[PDB]
mmCIF file of C-alpha atoms in Angstrom:
data_model
loop_
_atom_site.group_PDB
_atom_site.id
_atom_site.type_symbol
_atom_site.label_atom_id
_atom_site.label_comp_id
_atom_site.label_asym_id
_atom_site.label_seq_id
_atom_site.Cartn_x
_atom_site.Cartn_y
_atom_site.Cartn_z
ATOM 1 C CA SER A 525 -19.802 4.573 -53.403
ATOM 2 C CA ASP A 526 -18.546 2.671 -56.785
ATOM 3 C CA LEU A 527 -20.461 -0.711 -56.799
ATOM 4 C CA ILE A 528 -19.066 -3.158 -55.297
ATOM 5 C CA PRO A 529 -18.467 -5.930 -57.840
ATOM 6 C CA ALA A 530 -19.299 -9.485 -58.092
ATOM 7 C CA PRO A 531 -16.338 -11.363 -57.290
ATOM 8 C CA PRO A 532 -15.219 -14.102 -60.273
ATOM 9 C CA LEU A 533 -16.903 -17.137 -59.510
ATOM 10 C CA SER A 534 -13.250 -18.856 -58.571
ATOM 11 C CA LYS A 535 -13.754 -17.203 -55.407
ATOM 12 C CA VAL A 536 -17.132 -19.194 -54.629
ATOM 13 C CA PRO A 537 -16.708 -22.464 -53.394
ATOM 14 C CA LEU A 538 -19.331 -25.271 -54.767
ATOM 15 C CA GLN A 539 -20.418 -27.636 -51.890
ATOM 16 C CA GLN A 540 -19.192 -30.862 -53.344
ATOM 17 C CA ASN A 541 -21.483 -33.881 -53.722
ATOM 18 C CA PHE A 542 -24.693 -31.628 -53.662
ATOM 19 C CA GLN A 543 -27.437 -33.619 -52.302
ATOM 20 C CA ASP A 544 -31.120 -32.133 -53.889
ATOM 21 C CA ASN A 545 -33.168 -34.627 -51.891
ATOM 22 C CA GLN A 546 -31.228 -33.896 -48.779
ATOM 23 C CA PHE A 547 -31.236 -30.241 -49.060
ATOM 24 C CA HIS A 548 -35.049 -29.842 -49.592
ATOM 25 C CA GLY A 549 -37.490 -28.438 -47.301
ATOM 26 C CA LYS A 550 -37.443 -25.281 -45.187
ATOM 27 C CA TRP A 551 -34.805 -22.933 -44.157
ATOM 28 C CA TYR A 552 -34.738 -19.693 -41.946
ATOM 29 C CA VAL A 553 -32.695 -16.581 -43.408
ATOM 30 C CA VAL A 554 -30.444 -16.122 -40.532
ATOM 31 C CA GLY A 555 -27.901 -13.703 -42.582
ATOM 32 C CA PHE A 556 -27.692 -11.802 -45.507
ATOM 33 C CA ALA A 557 -25.583 -10.056 -46.755
ATOM 34 C CA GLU A 558 -25.668 -7.868 -50.149
ATOM 35 C CA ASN A 559 -23.853 -5.748 -52.593
ATOM 36 C CA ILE A 560 -25.880 -2.907 -51.498
ATOM 37 C CA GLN A 561 -25.006 -1.008 -48.363
ATOM 38 C CA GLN A 562 -27.552 -1.797 -45.720
ATOM 39 C CA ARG A 563 -29.180 1.558 -45.500
ATOM 40 C CA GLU A 564 -27.721 3.049 -42.592
ATOM 41 C CA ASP A 565 -30.211 3.397 -40.081
ATOM 42 C CA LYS A 566 -32.930 0.899 -41.435
ATOM 43 C CA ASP A 567 -35.596 -1.078 -39.012
ATOM 44 C CA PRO A 568 -33.955 -4.485 -38.488
ATOM 45 C CA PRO A 569 -35.709 -6.747 -40.777
ATOM 46 C CA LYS A 570 -37.708 -9.758 -39.553
ATOM 47 C CA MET A 571 -36.372 -13.311 -40.572
ATOM 48 C CA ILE A 572 -37.957 -15.345 -43.390
ATOM 49 C CA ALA A 573 -38.081 -18.163 -44.100
ATOM 50 C CA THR A 574 -37.470 -19.901 -47.751
ATOM 51 C CA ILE A 575 -38.898 -23.775 -49.047
ATOM 52 C CA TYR A 576 -37.234 -25.813 -51.648
ATOM 53 C CA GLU A 577 -39.145 -28.042 -52.647
ATOM 54 C CA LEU A 578 -37.670 -30.640 -55.067
ATOM 55 C CA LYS A 579 -40.096 -31.173 -57.700
ATOM 56 C CA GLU A 580 -40.305 -34.402 -59.949
ATOM 57 C CA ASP A 581 -38.756 -32.027 -62.531
ATOM 58 C CA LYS A 582 -35.728 -31.849 -60.706
ATOM 59 C CA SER A 583 -36.318 -28.101 -60.013
ATOM 60 C CA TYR A 584 -36.750 -26.625 -56.909
ATOM 61 C CA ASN A 585 -39.970 -24.940 -56.451
ATOM 62 C CA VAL A 586 -38.581 -21.818 -53.886
ATOM 63 C CA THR A 587 -41.261 -20.242 -51.801
ATOM 64 C CA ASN A 588 -40.370 -16.809 -49.815
ATOM 65 C CA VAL A 589 -42.385 -17.092 -46.714
ATOM 66 C CA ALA A 590 -42.603 -13.528 -44.546
ATOM 67 C CA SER A 591 -44.327 -10.824 -42.276
ATOM 68 C CA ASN A 592 -45.916 -7.501 -43.640
ATOM 69 C CA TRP A 593 -48.856 -5.545 -40.920
ATOM 70 C CA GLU A 594 -50.812 -8.407 -39.858
ATOM 71 C CA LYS A 595 -50.319 -10.483 -43.177
ATOM 72 C CA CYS A 596 -47.765 -13.048 -44.580
ATOM 73 C CA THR A 597 -46.613 -13.491 -48.180
ATOM 74 C CA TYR A 598 -45.922 -15.872 -49.988
ATOM 75 C CA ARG A 599 -43.460 -15.701 -53.450
ATOM 76 C CA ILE A 600 -42.592 -18.224 -55.607
ATOM 77 C CA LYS A 601 -39.767 -19.029 -58.189
ATOM 78 C CA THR A 602 -38.187 -21.881 -59.772
ATOM 79 C CA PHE A 603 -34.434 -23.315 -59.431
ATOM 80 C CA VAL A 604 -33.760 -24.809 -62.689
ATOM 81 C CA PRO A 605 -30.212 -27.323 -62.121
ATOM 82 C CA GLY A 606 -27.678 -25.834 -63.776
ATOM 83 C CA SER A 607 -24.161 -27.275 -65.064
ATOM 84 C CA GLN A 608 -22.784 -28.574 -61.623
ATOM 85 C CA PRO A 609 -24.637 -30.541 -58.922
ATOM 86 C CA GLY A 610 -25.658 -27.416 -56.279
ATOM 87 C CA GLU A 611 -26.156 -24.659 -59.119
ATOM 88 C CA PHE A 612 -28.986 -23.514 -60.557
ATOM 89 C CA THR A 613 -30.421 -21.027 -62.474
ATOM 90 C CA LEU A 614 -33.849 -19.114 -62.476
ATOM 91 C CA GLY A 615 -36.872 -20.853 -64.160
ATOM 92 C CA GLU A 616 -38.482 -17.869 -64.747
ATOM 93 C CA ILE A 617 -35.822 -15.627 -66.244
ATOM 94 C CA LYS A 618 -37.209 -14.625 -69.646
ATOM 95 C CA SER A 619 -39.611 -12.601 -67.665
ATOM 96 C CA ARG A 620 -37.959 -10.555 -65.387
ATOM 97 C CA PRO A 621 -37.583 -6.838 -66.602
ATOM 98 C CA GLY A 622 -34.497 -5.921 -67.222
ATOM 99 C CA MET A 623 -32.932 -9.460 -66.096
ATOM 100 C CA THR A 624 -30.028 -11.095 -68.295
ATOM 101 C CA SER A 625 -28.363 -13.543 -65.881
ATOM 102 C CA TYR A 626 -29.435 -15.327 -62.731
ATOM 103 C CA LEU A 627 -27.063 -17.861 -60.543
ATOM 104 C CA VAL A 628 -27.219 -19.945 -57.416
ATOM 105 C CA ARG A 629 -24.499 -21.728 -56.087
ATOM 106 C CA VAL A 630 -24.382 -23.651 -53.092
ATOM 107 C CA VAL A 631 -21.287 -23.138 -50.751
ATOM 108 C CA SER A 632 -21.725 -25.101 -48.166
ATOM 109 C CA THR A 633 -24.140 -27.078 -46.193
ATOM 110 C CA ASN A 634 -24.672 -30.209 -43.915
ATOM 111 C CA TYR A 635 -28.215 -30.102 -44.886
ATOM 112 C CA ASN A 636 -29.755 -30.792 -41.342
ATOM 113 C CA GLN A 637 -28.333 -27.426 -39.747
ATOM 114 C CA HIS A 638 -26.798 -24.694 -41.990
ATOM 115 C CA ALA A 639 -26.310 -23.791 -45.483
ATOM 116 C CA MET A 640 -24.126 -20.822 -47.392
ATOM 117 C CA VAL A 641 -25.608 -20.097 -50.662
ATOM 118 C CA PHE A 642 -24.128 -17.173 -53.248
ATOM 119 C CA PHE A 643 -26.372 -15.462 -55.885
ATOM 120 C CA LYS A 644 -25.462 -13.245 -58.562
ATOM 121 C CA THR A 645 -27.698 -11.661 -61.000
ATOM 122 C CA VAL A 646 -26.996 -9.194 -63.917
ATOM 123 C CA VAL A 647 -29.991 -6.730 -63.831
ATOM 124 C CA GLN A 648 -30.440 -3.380 -65.579
ATOM 125 C CA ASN A 649 -27.051 -4.625 -67.068
ATOM 126 C CA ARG A 650 -25.547 -4.182 -63.717
ATOM 127 C CA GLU A 651 -23.944 -6.969 -61.191
ATOM 128 C CA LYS A 652 -25.723 -7.588 -58.180
ATOM 129 C CA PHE A 653 -24.554 -10.164 -55.852
ATOM 130 C CA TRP A 654 -25.738 -11.599 -52.500
ATOM 131 C CA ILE A 655 -24.940 -14.198 -49.644
ATOM 132 C CA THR A 656 -27.336 -16.318 -47.285
ATOM 133 C CA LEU A 657 -26.907 -17.852 -44.185
ATOM 134 C CA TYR A 658 -29.747 -20.631 -43.601
ATOM 135 C CA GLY A 659 -30.771 -22.560 -40.635
ATOM 136 C CA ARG A 660 -33.134 -25.232 -39.963
ATOM 137 C CA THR A 661 -33.514 -23.472 -36.888
ATOM 138 C CA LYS A 662 -34.062 -19.244 -36.492
ATOM 139 C CA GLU A 663 -31.100 -19.146 -35.007
ATOM 140 C CA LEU A 664 -27.260 -20.610 -35.347
ATOM 141 C CA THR A 665 -24.158 -20.574 -33.199
ATOM 142 C CA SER A 666 -21.676 -17.861 -33.159
ATOM 143 C CA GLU A 667 -19.056 -19.869 -34.953
ATOM 144 C CA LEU A 668 -21.302 -20.573 -37.829
ATOM 145 C CA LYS A 669 -22.108 -16.809 -37.800
ATOM 146 C CA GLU A 670 -18.482 -15.638 -37.724
ATOM 147 C CA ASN A 671 -17.772 -18.019 -40.481
ATOM 148 C CA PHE A 672 -20.492 -16.334 -42.972
ATOM 149 C CA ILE A 673 -19.152 -12.598 -42.093
ATOM 150 C CA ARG A 674 -15.373 -14.040 -42.765
ATOM 151 C CA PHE A 675 -16.972 -15.434 -46.193
ATOM 152 C CA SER A 676 -18.833 -12.574 -47.040
ATOM 153 C CA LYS A 677 -15.436 -10.229 -46.591
ATOM 154 C CA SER A 678 -13.496 -12.690 -48.606
ATOM 155 C CA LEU A 679 -16.031 -11.290 -51.655
ATOM 156 C CA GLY A 680 -15.919 -7.864 -50.789
ATOM 157 C CA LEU A 681 -18.623 -7.189 -48.641
ATOM 158 C CA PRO A 682 -18.091 -4.823 -45.647
ATOM 159 C CA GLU A 683 -19.700 -5.234 -41.984
ATOM 160 C CA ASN A 684 -22.439 -2.846 -42.518
ATOM 161 C CA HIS A 685 -23.310 -4.963 -45.596
ATOM 162 C CA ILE A 686 -24.199 -8.171 -43.604
ATOM 163 C CA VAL A 687 -27.597 -8.350 -42.073
ATOM 164 C CA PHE A 688 -28.864 -11.026 -39.320
ATOM 165 C CA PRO A 689 -32.551 -10.666 -39.643
ATOM 166 C CA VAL A 690 -34.775 -11.023 -36.197
ATOM 167 C CA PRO A 691 -36.618 -14.322 -35.773
ATOM 168 C CA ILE A 692 -40.057 -13.765 -35.515
ATOM 169 C CA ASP A 693 -43.299 -16.280 -34.533
ATOM 170 C CA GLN A 694 -45.736 -14.999 -37.364
ATOM 171 C CA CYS A 695 -45.713 -16.597 -40.620
ATOM 172 C CA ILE A 696 -42.293 -18.375 -40.784
ATOM 173 C CA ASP A 697 -43.331 -21.130 -39.103
ATOM 174 C CA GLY A 698 -46.140 -22.622 -41.476
#
């Protein structure tokens, strides 16, 4: 297909009154939707956790924790506060091959249960974007999942670009 373009940022809400010290800690990636088509017959992915550690310099250390064969992998990046609370840039942008832009926008959260976060990068001179549905728990309600589907579709993503990863016991509980 044609690339699904990133929506104008006007179409991506910013969570009002974002509180960095309440968004801290571990989130499970309960849902994921990206502008590349799932893959078609693919193995359902195992759930990852993402830990947001608020540092004293006001950035987050962001650690993705995942299972692979009899091992756990941790990958760290830095989110640096952007122009408005709840927006971030990538601290490592200047070392990422082919990357010219990276934006994080926290769309919605209640801090103690769920969040939705929008990501947009320009890599190899093309737009990539994705939305994550975070839970403080590995499972969320049908209402929250449905709201995530609706929001994903509102940004142009077809249903078959939306993935609900499978909870696992390894790695992601620390």
